[PDB]
Amino acid sequence: PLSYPFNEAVALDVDPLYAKLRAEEPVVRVSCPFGEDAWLVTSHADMKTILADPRFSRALAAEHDESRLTPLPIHTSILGMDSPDHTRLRRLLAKVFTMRRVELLRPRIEQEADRLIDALIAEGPPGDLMEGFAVPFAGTVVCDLLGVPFEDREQFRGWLDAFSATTVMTEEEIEADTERLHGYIAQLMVRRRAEPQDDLISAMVKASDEEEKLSEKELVELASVLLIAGHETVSSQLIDSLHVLFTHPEQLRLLKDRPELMPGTVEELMRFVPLISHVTFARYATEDVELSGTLVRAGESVLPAIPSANRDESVFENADRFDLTREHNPHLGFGYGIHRCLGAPLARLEMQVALDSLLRRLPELRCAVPAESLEWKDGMQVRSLLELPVLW
């Protein structure tokens, strides 16, 4: 089997092999950096199957040496479960993580975006849209929603990479940092259990205590992945989307002249940005399934290359082009099926507010350096810039 990943990810460049695989051999056997060999899955149609079909299981990974890019299997909480356990956590979260709760955050999210831009302007150009905007924006928002104090970022931020590192941390460092984050969240739950605030951890603890619906460990691990998704995934998608807009100035011009395009722009950025560096978490077949002429037998794993599905020309016309006017856009950037992203309404709100605020307050915003001088963060399961210097 081919060794996978075929090539380490570069900037937002997509490996040309995916297009070749989608054309000529959409499912290919590979050997993974860690765990069992796997079937790499590349097409949109097969991606929906392995993410949503009940014959593909996440919970069965725990009974294998899970095919993976990370030295140890990730503690993915709800994203590691099947029904019924999955249903139990999903339902608790749906009941507390409501559309109303998110939409009610809108004034505070808009205010935080304005405050960060006030600071950028006060500090003078060039500013860093990563550490000076995307990171503290995403961080304050998820911290406010979850009830993790943003003032604790200095302690907890250095543990998050353990949930994402592929090539750049040892087993022992990952275990230690995973334990630190879980232990940190566990102590916060003792406080929020005694002294509830208007945040997700408080309401999760209350709903769970009152129905004996979740173990402490399950609560800790679930709150932990919510922190990572809000802090790391949002800021990564946001900074990558800014790079795409800067490098497609014609589309950026169109967005500023027709702001009603912003909802569709956010969806096109979800599809076009190859945010996931390679694949999301593996699933295992419960029965034989044929995908694209390749037989995946029971007990074998599949790797969902979501970014490749989002570049599937059989689904998106000119899929290799960023077009923020695109109307047909069944992208899988928020997943699909049972494990589809519960945070997508919030992520969409954050993306819209952040891009609208920057374009309205900083109309002349532009990248301060050639795209070739940028430093990207390597060795993680998602792509992000370390710095995005800008002028206005």
Ligand code: HEM
């Ligand atoms: C731009 C931002 C985000 C992107 C691109 C994103 C992407 C995704 C994707 C692709 C999945 C499915 C993974 C798979 O099936 O292997 C997922 C699941 C999930 N996401 Fe998001 N996410 C984002 C933000 C968030 C936020 C802000 C939260 C919560 C605060 C969140 C919470 C979750 C949860 C809990 C799941 C698992 C749901 C389940 O297993 O039923 N995400 N996300």
Ligand SMILES: CN[C@H](C(=O)N[C@H](CO)Cc1c[nH]c2ccccc12)C(C)C
């Ligand atoms: C490769 N998997 C991607 C990722 O960034 N995963 C990260 C790093 O492994 C962990 C994570 C982010 N959002 C989560 C939600 C629930 C459990 C785990 C995570 C996708 C999840 C985007």
